[PDB]
Amino acid sequence: AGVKAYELRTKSKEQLASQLVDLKKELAELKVQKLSRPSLPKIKTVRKSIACVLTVINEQQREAVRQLYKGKKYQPKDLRAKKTRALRRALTKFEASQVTEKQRKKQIAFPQRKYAIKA
Amino acid sequence: EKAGHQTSAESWGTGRAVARIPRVGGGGTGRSGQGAFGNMCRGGRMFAPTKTWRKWNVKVNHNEKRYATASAIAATAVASLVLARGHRVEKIPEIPLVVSTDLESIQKTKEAVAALKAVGAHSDLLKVLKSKKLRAGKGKYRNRRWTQRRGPLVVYAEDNGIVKALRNVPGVETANVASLNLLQLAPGAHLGRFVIWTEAAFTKLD
Amino acid sequence: NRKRPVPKGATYGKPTNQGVNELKYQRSLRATAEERVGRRAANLRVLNSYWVNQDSTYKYFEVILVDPQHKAIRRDARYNWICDPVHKHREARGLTATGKKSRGINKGHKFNNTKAGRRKTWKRQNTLSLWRYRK
Amino acid sequence: AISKNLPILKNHFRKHWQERVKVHFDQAGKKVSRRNARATRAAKIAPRPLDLLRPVVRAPTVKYNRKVRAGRGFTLAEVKAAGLTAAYARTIGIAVDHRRQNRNQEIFDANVQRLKEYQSKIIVFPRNGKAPEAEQVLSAAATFP
Amino acid sequence: AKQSLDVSSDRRKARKAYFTAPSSQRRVLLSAPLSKELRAQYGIKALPIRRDDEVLVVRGSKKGQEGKISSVYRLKFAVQVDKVTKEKVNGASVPINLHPSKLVITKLHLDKDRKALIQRKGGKL
Amino acid sequence: AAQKSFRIKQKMAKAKKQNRPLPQWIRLRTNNTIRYNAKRRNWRRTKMNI
RNA sequence: UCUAGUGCAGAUCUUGGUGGUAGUAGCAAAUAUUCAAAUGAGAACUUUGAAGACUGAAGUGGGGAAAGGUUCCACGUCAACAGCAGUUGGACGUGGGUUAGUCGAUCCUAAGAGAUGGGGAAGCUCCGUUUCAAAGGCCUGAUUUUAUGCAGGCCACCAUCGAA
RNA sequence: UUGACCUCAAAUCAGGUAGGAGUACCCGCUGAACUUAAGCAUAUCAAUAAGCGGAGGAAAAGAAACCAACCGGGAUUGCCUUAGUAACGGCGAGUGAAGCGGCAAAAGCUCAAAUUUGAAAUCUGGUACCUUCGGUGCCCGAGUUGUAAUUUGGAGAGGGCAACUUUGGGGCCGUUCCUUGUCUAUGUUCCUUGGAACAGGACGUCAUAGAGGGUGAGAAUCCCGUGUGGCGAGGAGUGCGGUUCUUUGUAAAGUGCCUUCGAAGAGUCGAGUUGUUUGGGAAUGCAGCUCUAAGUGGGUGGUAAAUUCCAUCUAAAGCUAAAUAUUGGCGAGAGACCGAUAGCGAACAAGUACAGUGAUGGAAAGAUGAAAAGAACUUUGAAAAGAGAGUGAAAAAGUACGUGAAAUU
RNA sequence: AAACUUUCAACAACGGAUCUCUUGGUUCUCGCAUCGAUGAAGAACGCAGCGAAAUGCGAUACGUAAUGUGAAUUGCAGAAUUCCGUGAAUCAUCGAAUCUUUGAACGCACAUUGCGCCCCUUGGUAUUCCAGGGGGCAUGCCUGUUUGAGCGUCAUUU
Ligand SMILES: [Mg+2]
Ligand SMILES: [Mg+2]
Ligand SMILES: [Mg+2]
Ligand SMILES: [Mg+2]
Ligand SMILES: [Mg+2]
Ligand SMILES: [Mg+2]
Ligand SMILES: [Mg+2]
Ligand SMILES: [Mg+2]
Ligand SMILES: [Mg+2]
Ligand SMILES: [Mg+2]
Ligand SMILES: [Mg+2]
Ligand SMILES: [Mg+2]
Ligand SMILES: [Mg+2]
Ligand SMILES: [Mg+2]
Ligand SMILES: [Mg+2]
Ligand SMILES: [Mg+2]
Ligand SMILES: [Mg+2]
Ligand SMILES: [Mg+2]
Ligand SMILES: [Mg+2]
Ligand SMILES: [Mg+2]
Ligand SMILES: [Mg+2]
Ligand SMILES: [Mg+2]
Ligand SMILES: [Mg+2]
Ligand SMILES: [Mg+2]
Ligand SMILES: [Mg+2]
Ligand SMILES: [Mg+2]
Ligand SMILES: [Mg+2]
Ligand SMILES: [Mg+2]
Ligand SMILES: [Mg+2]
Ligand SMILES: [Mg+2]
């Protein structure tokens, strides 16, 4: 069974930390029983619930950092985009669409026209 | 190009009471000391490896192609040659078998098949249906699994549905008069395919 | 010149290749200057170079470089072609003025071997072209 | 190695030629690709004729001067005489060559008439509105052989 | 015949796609036809089979036998029905693995998703 | 050697954990072709060379 | 009818397998074994006891370095291995086991290796190790927005690695 | 004394950037020998392999200091050809292009050198705000040892006259492209054989679907699919197709006639010598050294030199798609290919086990049966096993498992 | 005459050929362009209820989140609320995260799981010592800032 992330995202940070320490206590109490019993698969659900809780906590923290750095240049290098090194070093579509006043005037004066040949 | 040569074999020469074929070096495997690089050797290089720059396609003179296609068309109007291909035209009244240009506008395989039954190709279709057999050799698992006879070749002037109506009927081929492939007209280099002409095609042939 | 880096002048071959001293390095001194400057500053792109002075031991060159990361060059359409990645280490491939000079890349009958690229023309006219229908 | 009466053969295969053998199996597929590319380009320039108007020009090399041939471009004087500028012509489907010169009045006037015919045969849609659908053809060369 | 250039008629590729299929595609591969009654009552010819369907065997040595599905053993491309078993020498009962192509569904296990699937496939309920 | 590096001890521990036969439920699995453990090492037959 | 990786007795041919030789050569260095009981299906060889012997302290003893890597110990146990045997085992299977402020490593420098600065070299990289360098950090406080700058003074080896 | 400038430094200064992998194809440097010459040294192998540096989806080249000698052509690349030709070559062995012509594909351009001088008009950065691949305002700064506008030789600029013509950016809905999902026919009717019908025969159906695969034996009609169309989802996008808002703009561009001008790249061109290279031949290119220009000039015009002409371009600065390549990567489709001693070394826990100090070397090994139904139970035996029994269509299928050859027994 | 040798056949052996299979290879064609200091490729060590490998992953460890489908997984055990549903699954998709020790590998070193310095915080009666936790400290080069150096150098001082 385990915990569901959609009912954890409604919780606060402290509630989640208490949940996490309780789950770790349960995991220790289960590891002391695993050596007595022949088999104990209940431990898997507790492990995955710990993972879900930590994922939710990470998300909650990262979104707050995103909102702190919202709308300003120089945000951190784990909240930026990863796309690729070369695509990150590539010219933007602004810098690549820049032209001189000489070429702008010629593009405006003599653009490629739409012509057809029947008459 | 790499095959039989991804090893560093060198001959032991004479004095070791073995043959002078080059051998794998090192030790500890089983391949150590085995023959290598030879066509007589297990794991070696086949004699005269096959190349892609073999000649695959052949020039045939245009006029010889056309001579042969004309001959294969003329052989269609010979009941002795069509029977000798096994085309089941004994009850067919006479050939060249010409039907109306109404056949070019047929859209449905059912109607197309019924027209051929009425005209007389019923047995030449049943032959194909009965002749499906598994190919014998290793072509089966080379996407050549099923063999069968061919039935008639329907020749049209313009396509208004007939090729799609006859696309799924086994054995039946369709052709336009302009192209008229020799591979269809004389399959296996045997003359006398059963050809059903439309009147427009029979007229455009001139 | 370029002394052949070979121990004690032994080349282990035929007399035509026994030369050690009189060899000349097909690339120019301007070129090997551009190389060293581009290795010292790999974040920049070499644009051109020019002689400024010389003596018996040394030749002195000034290399113009351009930072393709600076926004004054990222913008400024006249110079943002250097910021494309096909211009990384131009000097190392021979795309500068002296690089093309030394590659022999000019128009005309005097540059038939080196017009489109020497190795390209060699590979072209030492290639057997075979067609489906053999001509 | 030299033997009975046979011609002296000069077969140049003493290099590692098997490493460089291009067999053009790609002939058919590459034709298909060219046709698809022409189709895509035509659809992208959907009214336009896929080729620029090229001039009629006289071939060099006294072996070939008996034949007239298609050239590169319309020789700025020729277009000026045709009554339009080089920049506008380049946007209208007329190849211009700035480096060739007119030394022959017959070729000059033939090309000028070529340009007049082209200008009378084309319709140029305004830069503003309608785009009055116009049934592209795919060759100006076939229309002006 | 085929006309698309995205489709393959290679036996090798088809067999690899069959034997290395994931469980989500083995579900669709393991479809079964409906009886005449149900194909009339719903308008569906066949459906992917699941655990609580009632089924009738129409080929093999277990011809005529009815039962309730017990397992859809997708790994083996098989179906275990209860009341269809082999009795071993050691008094044990071992389920016989059937292919759903040789079955006929007589009573469907319905839920929101099967109903949606049927209305999607053009059914009437 | 008794006085040894942690690295060598670590690799030795991995080898001790690898020095196992097969589990026998792996032989009962659907479409199983593993009969025995072919990567089995013994200190007398083959040295690790680490 | 088309097509070719198309026909084996040889190549001290390749790979795999099998014979005769042949139950043959042989299983003989290191002084040496014997009796009983127990165990066990079964004992020349396992265990115990009794006896007889050897190594003979520059040992067949007790410990270690390198190397090995769990061979250590226990329990179970014999299909293979232990060139006879085997109930035994450095074998097989399952587990347990290595506790440091004081023992070593860690640190120092040795022969030497090797960055930096610089200089060579098309270049992979080479030289060189205090050098043709603007090559650092150590004591005490003063202030009491106050944390630690300025107040002072001092000092000039100039990386680092290198020994169980 | 204070404050500048210049040049050089330090900072865990604020922001960034380079390295390595891969390397089939691409740009370069470096660079053999085996071999051929029936010997061998030039030559050839080869401007190849190996070594080194450097890129992208292509790279490079590229808008003539070209080809030519024609009634002249007109960036570059590639194909057909030119051509095994002209030429090189112990003129031996051998090597060996280019112009024209036909085609694929086509696309052109921009800086320096000019006084904005009645107004550094230019730009990075920081900071506040905003509709954020960026904009506006402010503030330090760069910069006159020259940042913008203006022009690039095809031209063009400064004045003077005369009239005309044409324009920008956002939104919305579609279409284009990419990726993806889903829906879309017809027998499991009868008899025989068989363990199983997917076999044979009878009667039928669908077919723009009889491609392929699966299912207890050769299945269009049992399943997935196939074929034909439909209905969606998510993106990229300025390619165009319509609609809507902003009016850019007392701006810009184009065209005619007169007049005065018309800047055009230097340790470079070129020359001598050396070396290498080329078909390049009194020297094809490249590099080193030495010498070292001009402006009605300079280069080229395939025999060195002087003189007189002619033709053709405009170097020493620069950008640019397509046609072209691709034994690598990702994703697809095919084959008169191989079929487990074959085919990649590897159809399997294969670059694995294993060997070697190490660089490196490098295997063998696929198939029970439809289904484990993988032999309950009795008995002899210490046990392994055997004999029975039993499962199976078949144990002449018993995990030493399809068939089960020969040697050998 | 037997035994023994040889030859043939039947059955049984040895062995693994032949035959038939093929989730593999090889070649041709087509389309696309996407590694890395935002830490790549590679490596080591670990991770499952019962695994030694292969495959997958990284102390959130054969995986977490999200989305889609819509009831499995399977060798055994176990689990059930997860079944007319924010939901099974070794499922598919995948846009958010985690990603030990390393590695171009970046505090200095490395045949060491070695030795440091700075900031914040906690504790031990502690600016200094010990420890714990979190966060940092490479090199070259560019733009800029700040602090400076030099009779290189200008002016202006009284
Ligand atoms: Mg001998
Ligand atoms: Mg030198
Ligand atoms: Mg040599
Ligand atoms: Mg052969
Ligand atoms: Mg033989
Ligand atoms: Mg013979
Ligand atoms: Mg032999
Ligand atoms: Mg004996
Ligand atoms: Mg002896
Ligand atoms: Mg022991
Ligand atoms: Mg023994
Ligand atoms: Mg024994
Ligand atoms: Mg050194
Ligand atoms: Mg030390
Ligand atoms: Mg010591
Ligand atoms: Mg020779
Ligand atoms: Mg010879
Ligand atoms: Mg010789
Ligand atoms: Mg190479
Ligand atoms: Mg390019
Ligand atoms: Mg270029
Ligand atoms: Mg000829
Ligand atoms: Mg040559
Ligand atoms: Mg010379
Ligand atoms: Mg050379
Ligand atoms: Mg020369
Ligand atoms: Mg049988
Ligand atoms: Mg059998
Ligand atoms: Mg058998
Ligand atoms: Mg025999």
PDB file of N, CA, C and O in Angstrom, chain B residues 143-170:
ATOM      1  N   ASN B 143      11.555 -14.482 -46.020  1.00  0.00           N
ATOM      2  CA  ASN B 143      10.400 -13.717 -46.482  1.00  0.00           C
ATOM      3  C   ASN B 143       9.993 -14.125 -47.891  1.00  0.00           C
ATOM      4  O   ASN B 143       9.586 -13.301 -48.710  1.00  0.00           O
ATOM      5  N   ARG B 144      10.088 -15.419 -48.160  1.00  0.00           N
ATOM      6  CA  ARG B 144       9.700 -16.048 -49.412  1.00  0.00           C
ATOM      7  C   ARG B 144       8.932 -17.329 -49.118  1.00  0.00           C
ATOM      8  O   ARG B 144       9.207 -18.401 -49.655  1.00  0.00           O
ATOM      9  N   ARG B 145       7.951 -17.225 -48.231  1.00  0.00           N
ATOM     10  CA  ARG B 145       7.426 -18.408 -47.562  1.00  0.00           C
ATOM     11  C   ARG B 145       6.443 -19.191 -48.416  1.00  0.00           C
ATOM     12  O   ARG B 145       6.393 -20.422 -48.321  1.00  0.00           O
ATOM     13  N   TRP B 146       5.667 -18.516 -49.248  1.00  0.00           N
ATOM     14  CA  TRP B 146       4.586 -19.146 -49.984  1.00  0.00           C
ATOM     15  C   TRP B 146       4.791 -19.001 -51.481  1.00  0.00           C
ATOM     16  O   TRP B 146       5.164 -17.931 -51.971  1.00  0.00           O
ATOM     17  N   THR B 147       4.556 -20.096 -52.192  1.00  0.00           N
ATOM     18  CA  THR B 147       4.613 -20.146 -53.640  1.00  0.00           C
ATOM     19  C   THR B 147       3.219 -20.415 -54.180  1.00  0.00           C
ATOM     20  O   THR B 147       2.377 -21.003 -53.501  1.00  0.00           O
ATOM     21  N   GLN B 148       2.977 -19.963 -55.406  1.00  0.00           N
ATOM     22  CA  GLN B 148       1.713 -20.215 -56.074  1.00  0.00           C
ATOM     23  C   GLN B 148       1.848 -19.836 -57.537  1.00  0.00           C
ATOM     24  O   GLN B 148       2.779 -19.138 -57.940  1.00  0.00           O
ATOM     25  N   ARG B 149       0.902 -20.311 -58.328  1.00  0.00           N
ATOM     26  CA  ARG B 149       0.829 -19.958 -59.734  1.00  0.00           C
ATOM     27  C   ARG B 149       0.391 -18.501 -59.859  1.00  0.00           C
ATOM     28  O   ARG B 149       0.051 -17.847 -58.870  1.00  0.00           O
ATOM     29  N   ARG B 150       0.416 -17.968 -61.076  1.00  0.00           N
ATOM     30  CA  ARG B 150      -0.233 -16.709 -61.398  1.00  0.00           C
ATOM     31  C   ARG B 150      -1.464 -17.011 -62.230  1.00  0.00           C
ATOM     32  O   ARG B 150      -1.527 -18.044 -62.903  1.00  0.00           O
ATOM     33  N   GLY B 151      -2.430 -16.109 -62.181  1.00  0.00           N
ATOM     34  CA  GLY B 151      -3.614 -16.207 -62.986  1.00  0.00           C
ATOM     35  C   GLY B 151      -3.518 -15.260 -64.159  1.00  0.00           C
ATOM     36  O   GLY B 151      -2.437 -15.053 -64.717  1.00  0.00           O
ATOM     37  N   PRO B 152      -4.629 -14.659 -64.558  1.00  0.00           N
ATOM     38  CA  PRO B 152      -4.592 -13.765 -65.711  1.00  0.00           C
ATOM     39  C   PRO B 152      -3.962 -12.413 -65.414  1.00  0.00           C
ATOM     40  O   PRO B 152      -3.871 -11.947 -64.274  1.00  0.00           O
ATOM     41  N   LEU B 153      -3.503 -11.806 -66.498  1.00  0.00           N
ATOM     42  CA  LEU B 153      -3.049 -10.429 -66.528  1.00  0.00           C
ATOM     43  C   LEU B 153      -4.119  -9.589 -67.204  1.00  0.00           C
ATOM     44  O   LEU B 153      -4.406  -9.780 -68.387  1.00  0.00           O
ATOM     45  N   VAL B 154      -4.718  -8.679 -66.450  1.00  0.00           N
ATOM     46  CA  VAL B 154      -5.752  -7.784 -66.947  1.00  0.00           C
ATOM     47  C   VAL B 154      -5.062  -6.515 -67.418  1.00  0.00           C
ATOM     48  O   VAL B 154      -4.357  -5.853 -66.645  1.00  0.00           O
ATOM     49  N   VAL B 155      -5.267  -6.174 -68.683  1.00  0.00           N
ATOM     50  CA  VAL B 155      -4.629  -5.023 -69.303  1.00  0.00           C
ATOM     51  C   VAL B 155      -5.687  -3.961 -69.549  1.00  0.00           C
ATOM     52  O   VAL B 155      -6.695  -4.216 -70.218  1.00  0.00           O
ATOM     53  N   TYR B 156      -5.449  -2.771 -69.011  1.00  0.00           N
ATOM     54  CA  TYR B 156      -6.365  -1.649 -69.084  1.00  0.00           C
ATOM     55  C   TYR B 156      -5.666  -0.461 -69.726  1.00  0.00           C
ATOM     56  O   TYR B 156      -4.438  -0.415 -69.812  1.00  0.00           O
ATOM     57  N   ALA B 157      -6.468   0.500 -70.179  1.00  0.00           N
ATOM     58  CA  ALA B 157      -5.923   1.739 -70.714  1.00  0.00           C
ATOM     59  C   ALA B 157      -5.847   2.819 -69.645  1.00  0.00           C
ATOM     60  O   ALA B 157      -4.822   3.498 -69.517  1.00  0.00           O
ATOM     61  N   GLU B 158      -6.920   2.994 -68.876  1.00  0.00           N
ATOM     62  CA  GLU B 158      -6.950   3.928 -67.762  1.00  0.00           C
ATOM     63  C   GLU B 158      -7.520   3.227 -66.540  1.00  0.00           C
ATOM     64  O   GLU B 158      -8.448   2.422 -66.642  1.00  0.00           O
ATOM     65  N   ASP B 159      -6.951   3.541 -65.379  1.00  0.00           N
ATOM     66  CA  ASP B 159      -7.339   2.925 -64.118  1.00  0.00           C
ATOM     67  C   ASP B 159      -8.371   3.801 -63.427  1.00  0.00           C
ATOM     68  O   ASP B 159      -8.072   4.933 -63.035  1.00  0.00           O
ATOM     69  N   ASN B 160      -9.581   3.273 -63.284  1.00  0.00           N
ATOM     70  CA  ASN B 160     -10.647   3.900 -62.522  1.00  0.00           C
ATOM     71  C   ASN B 160     -11.173   2.945 -61.461  1.00  0.00           C
ATOM     72  O   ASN B 160     -12.374   2.891 -61.185  1.00  0.00           O
ATOM     73  N   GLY B 161     -10.270   2.172 -60.852  1.00  0.00           N
ATOM     74  CA  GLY B 161     -10.594   1.293 -59.746  1.00  0.00           C
ATOM     75  C   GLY B 161     -10.235  -0.159 -59.956  1.00  0.00           C
ATOM     76  O   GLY B 161     -10.245  -0.927 -58.985  1.00  0.00           O
ATOM     77  N   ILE B 162      -9.915  -0.566 -61.183  1.00  0.00           N
ATOM     78  CA  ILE B 162      -9.741  -1.983 -61.463  1.00  0.00           C
ATOM     79  C   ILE B 162      -8.498  -2.539 -60.780  1.00  0.00           C
ATOM     80  O   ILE B 162      -8.503  -3.685 -60.313  1.00  0.00           O
ATOM     81  N   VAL B 163      -7.429  -1.749 -60.683  1.00  0.00           N
ATOM     82  CA  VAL B 163      -6.209  -2.272 -60.088  1.00  0.00           C
ATOM     83  C   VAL B 163      -6.391  -2.519 -58.604  1.00  0.00           C
ATOM     84  O   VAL B 163      -5.919  -3.536 -58.096  1.00  0.00           O
ATOM     85  N   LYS B 164      -7.107  -1.650 -57.900  1.00  0.00           N
ATOM     86  CA  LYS B 164      -7.407  -1.892 -56.503  1.00  0.00           C
ATOM     87  C   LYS B 164      -8.453  -2.972 -56.305  1.00  0.00           C
ATOM     88  O   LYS B 164      -8.401  -3.685 -55.298  1.00  0.00           O
ATOM     89  N   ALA B 165      -9.386  -3.118 -57.242  1.00  0.00           N
ATOM     90  CA  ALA B 165     -10.357  -4.197 -57.148  1.00  0.00           C
ATOM     91  C   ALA B 165      -9.701  -5.561 -57.308  1.00  0.00           C
ATOM     92  O   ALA B 165     -10.159  -6.538 -56.707  1.00  0.00           O
ATOM     93  N   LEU B 166      -8.644  -5.649 -58.111  1.00  0.00           N
ATOM     94  CA  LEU B 166      -7.951  -6.905 -58.361  1.00  0.00           C
ATOM     95  C   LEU B 166      -6.644  -7.028 -57.588  1.00  0.00           C
ATOM     96  O   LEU B 166      -5.935  -8.025 -57.743  1.00  0.00           O
ATOM     97  N   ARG B 167      -6.312  -6.033 -56.769  1.00  0.00           N
ATOM     98  CA  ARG B 167      -5.091  -6.063 -55.979  1.00  0.00           C
ATOM     99  C   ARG B 167      -5.016  -7.272 -55.062  1.00  0.00           C
ATOM    100  O   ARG B 167      -3.935  -7.845 -54.890  1.00  0.00           O
ATOM    101  N   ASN B 168      -6.135  -7.682 -54.474  1.00  0.00           N
ATOM    102  CA  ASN B 168      -6.123  -8.725 -53.459  1.00  0.00           C
ATOM    103  C   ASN B 168      -6.428 -10.110 -54.005  1.00  0.00           C
ATOM    104  O   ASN B 168      -6.208 -11.097 -53.296  1.00  0.00           O
ATOM    105  N   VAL B 169      -6.935 -10.214 -55.226  1.00  0.00           N
ATOM    106  CA  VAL B 169      -7.235 -11.513 -55.814  1.00  0.00           C
ATOM    107  C   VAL B 169      -5.908 -12.209 -56.088  1.00  0.00           C
ATOM    108  O   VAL B 169      -5.070 -11.658 -56.814  1.00  0.00           O
ATOM    109  N   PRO B 170      -5.655 -13.397 -55.536  1.00  0.00           N
ATOM    110  CA  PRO B 170      -4.341 -14.016 -55.734  1.00  0.00           C
ATOM    111  C   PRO B 170      -4.132 -14.427 -57.181  1.00  0.00           C
ATOM    112  O   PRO B 170      -5.034 -14.959 -57.832  1.00  0.00           O
TER     113      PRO B 170
END
